[PDB]
């Protein structure tokens, strides 16, 4: 029988969850009788975010209908869709491309738990699967400052437009990945360091605990991502979670701190779809119209907390609602905890 | 007493019908919006409802705030569809056609203007505020210009060929001492810039310009910068010529580039990062460096079309972008003719 903390368990049993990671798939609409969870591979993966990338150039360099059909066919063939009686998708523009490049994101990171799940040991299995994460995982103190100070940040920061839920904090872990202590080091030393949020389906921790959060493919479509392929963070503890994927049928997710050095950041309004940042940055911030009251942040060990309530920005012309941080260096950032939070659907309007 | 060639030119481009045209062709109400009435103030409010339009469709904004911004256009700017329903305005694509029908408008405006403003032709010329003097058949600039033009016509823009008809060498008065500061740039450049002629009335008084505050940043592939290209068919593509009319106008300028930031996707910016003086989008083709020719820190980019090893790139043909007007100089103006098949 493990003699890992309870809370730590739990989590475990969350993590590597087969049921979740269908539940994953048949929400992208994934025909899992044509393509099982055992099925997926990486090869398959790759080549659909291959075919995503044709696909967009096809549109910019103007390809004919015939050529954009023939590549939605492909693309089709190899991720196999249930659409019940729905229209399937054509993918000629940036939004149908977009949303296949999440499903694709995902599919990416269901093929690694799975993978993982389905290694090693057949002890308490619990234990096994644990070592598996190549993560020392202690539970936080409810009691702590350390811990009052995150339900501050997730309470302060929720979005006043992601109103269909409230967040409970269920469980803080810290979490050290091994060797990314060593691989922060050098940009320890890097000034405008930020303490923010990542959020991410459930069974994508066992990826994101393994092997860290990761940049897409090169075979994945830059033009993919608002700010092309670089790691994603919110400063709005609402934001992050909505990447959560949780709803009332199924309504605990996984949340991550993380410092992130941001630097000199390149300011952004609107989408650029870049891959490399010009000389002098280190990083994107997307601004965002609500900004974290810069007379509430803190900052420990030179770290930044952005955890002031949401007020303007100077900003009104930009996509965005909220700021968004990208660093395009996956050693630029290290976790630091992750949360566990019940999201409590609402009832009344009022 | 003007020249001939020089003649057509002020005439072609002050034509009051071509306006009413090009109005028509947009499906603007010409009884409610009469070329008389088109005002600047109209179109800058016209542009700021798509800047609304594309801001609520990214920030997720619900549909019945779309649907009512979009009513707001076709309030704002009269349309005649007359059976036909007018094109919601709730995507990037509807948003874009509208884009790019201001643009015009705006320097429809411009001319139209000038023209009421204040033997006519030459009253015409004087408000231009720009000197124009031909260029000779046979002189070595318009062999230059010449071999460019062929060097550089694009492939995959086969439906026609391209002859030059008239050469103009054009100084907007006030333009060399704006560009003053940006001579000392390196990488200046000598490219163009196609518009139809609707527009070159407003180009010659005013210069190449940016967009308006109030226009939307993300309807344009790189944001609101000045466009050119090193292909002349790039740029000949933006004349809008057909079979039923087949004579375009075509710039030369000249451009400081300076520290180029370069860019395979779009970037939907009004501002560079520090250390950068403009875009280079990445084409999939470029011209040969080989067959370049610098004269007085001038690059002159005549080499014919050669792959760039970039293939994952938005972009068959390379362009240009500034961010500011004064790093434009123009130098010249062309005429010319496009040779369909068909
Ligand atoms: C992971 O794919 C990145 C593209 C989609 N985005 C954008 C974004 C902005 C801010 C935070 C997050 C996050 N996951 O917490 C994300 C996110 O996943
Ligand atoms: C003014 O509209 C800006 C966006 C449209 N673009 C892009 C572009 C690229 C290269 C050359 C030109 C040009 N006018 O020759 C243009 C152009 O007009």
Redesign the interface.
């Known amino acids: 029988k493990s003699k890992l903390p309870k809370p730590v368990q739990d989590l475990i049993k969350m993590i590597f969850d087969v049921e979740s990671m269908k539940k994953a798939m048949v929400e992208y609409e994934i025909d899992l009788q044509k393509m099982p969870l055992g099925k997926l591979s990486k090869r398959q993966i790759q080549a659909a975010y291959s075919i995503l990338?044709e696909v967009?150039?096809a549109v910019?360099?103007?390809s004919s209908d015939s050529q954009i059909l023939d590549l939605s066919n492909r693309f089709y063939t190899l991720i196999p869709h249930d659409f019940g009686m729905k229209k399937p998708p054509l993918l000629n523009?940036?939004?149908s491309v977009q949303a296949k490049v999440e499903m694709l994101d995902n599919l990416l990171d269901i093929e690694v738990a799975y993978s993982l799940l389905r290694g090693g040991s057949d002890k308490d299995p619990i234990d096994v699967n644990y070592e598996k994460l190549k993560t020392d995982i202690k539970v936080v103190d409810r009691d702590s400052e350390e811990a009052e100070i995150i339900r501050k940040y997730v309470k302060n920061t929720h979005a006043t437009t992601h109103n269909a839920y409230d967040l409970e904090v269920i469980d803080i872990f810290k979490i050290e990945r091994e060797g990314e202590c060593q691989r922060y080091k050098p940009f320890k030393q890097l000034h405008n360091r930020r303490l923010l949020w990542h959020g991410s389906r459930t069974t994508n921790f066992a990826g994101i605990l393994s092997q860290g959060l990761r940049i897409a493919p090169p075979e994945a479509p830059?033009?993919g991502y608002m700010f092309?392929k670089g790691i994603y963070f919110a400063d709005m503890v609402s934001k992050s979670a909505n990447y959560c994927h949780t709803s009332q049928g199924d309504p605990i997710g996984l949340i991550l701190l993380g410092e992130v050095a941001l630097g000199n950041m390149?300011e952004?309004?609107?989408?650029?779809?870049?891959?490399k940042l010009?000389?002098?940055?280190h990083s994107v911030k997307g601004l965002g119209?609500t900004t974290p009251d810069p007379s509430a942040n803190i900052s420990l060990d030179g770290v930044d907390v952005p955890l002031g309530t949401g007020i303007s920005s100077g900003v009104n012309?930009?996509?965005?609602?909220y700021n968004e941080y990208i660093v395009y260096d996956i050693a630029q950032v290290n976790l630091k905890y992750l949360l566990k939070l019940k999201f409590n659907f609402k009832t009344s309007l009022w």
């Open positions: 990338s967009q150039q910019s360099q103007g523009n940036a939004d830059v033009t092309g390149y952004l309004k609107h989408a650029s779809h870049i891959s010009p000389k002098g940055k119209k012309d930009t996509s965005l609602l």
